[PDB]
C-alpha cells in the first residue's frame, strides 16, 4: 500500500492535419513536470509515446530526452490515408513513460485526446492534458 505522491507534470501538443495533402499530423510538444526516475542527479529520460486510438495503428514515440524532468521532444508525425471524417473518431494516447536502460517501463501517467469533436479545420490548436494515475475517478 501507499498514499503520499505528488508530480505527473503536464503535457502539451498542437493537432495539425495536411489538409493540403490531406493527412494527418500529430505534433508533441514538450512536457513539464515530469517526475524524476533515477536515483542519480535528481533526473530521468522521459517520453511521450504517440498512438492513433482506437486504430492504434500508426504508434510512434517521441525522442528519448536525457536527463531532464522538462524534455522538450516537439516532434510531428505525418499520416496519409485518414478520410478526415474519421478524425472523430481518432484519438491521440500520450504515455507519459521513463525509459532508462534495462528495459525500464514505469508509465508516470497515461494522456488521451479524443479528436471526437475537435475541429482542426480551422487550422492548428494548441492543446494540454494533465498527468495522473490512470483514467480512473478524476
Request: zero cysteines; a negative charge.
Amino acid at each position: 500500500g501507499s498514499s503520499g505522491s505528488s508530480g505527473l507534470g503536464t503535457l502539451f501538443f498542437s493537432l495539425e492535419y495536411n489538409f493540403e495533402r490531406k493527412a494527418f499530423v500529430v505534433n508533441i510538444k514538450e512536457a513539464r513536470g515530469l517526475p524524476a526516475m533515477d536515483e542519480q542527479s535528481m533526473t530521468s529520460d522521459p517520453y511521450i509515446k504517440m498512438t492513433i486510438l482506437p486504430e492504434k495503428k500508426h504508434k510512434v514515440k517521441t525522442r528519448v530526452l536525457r536527463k531532464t524532468l522538462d524534455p522538450a521532444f516537439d516532434e510531428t508525425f505525418t499520416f496519409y490515408g485518414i478520410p478526415y471524417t474519421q478524425i472523430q473518431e481518432l484519438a491521440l494516447h500520450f504515455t507519459i513513460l521513463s525509459f532508462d536502460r534495462f528495459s525500464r517501463d514505469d508509465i508516470i501517467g497515461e494522456v488521451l485526446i479524443p479528436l471526437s469533436g475537435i475541429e482542426l479545420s480551422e487550422g492548428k490548436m494548441l492543446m494540454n492534458r494533465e498527468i495522473i494515475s490512470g483514467p480512473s475517478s478524476g
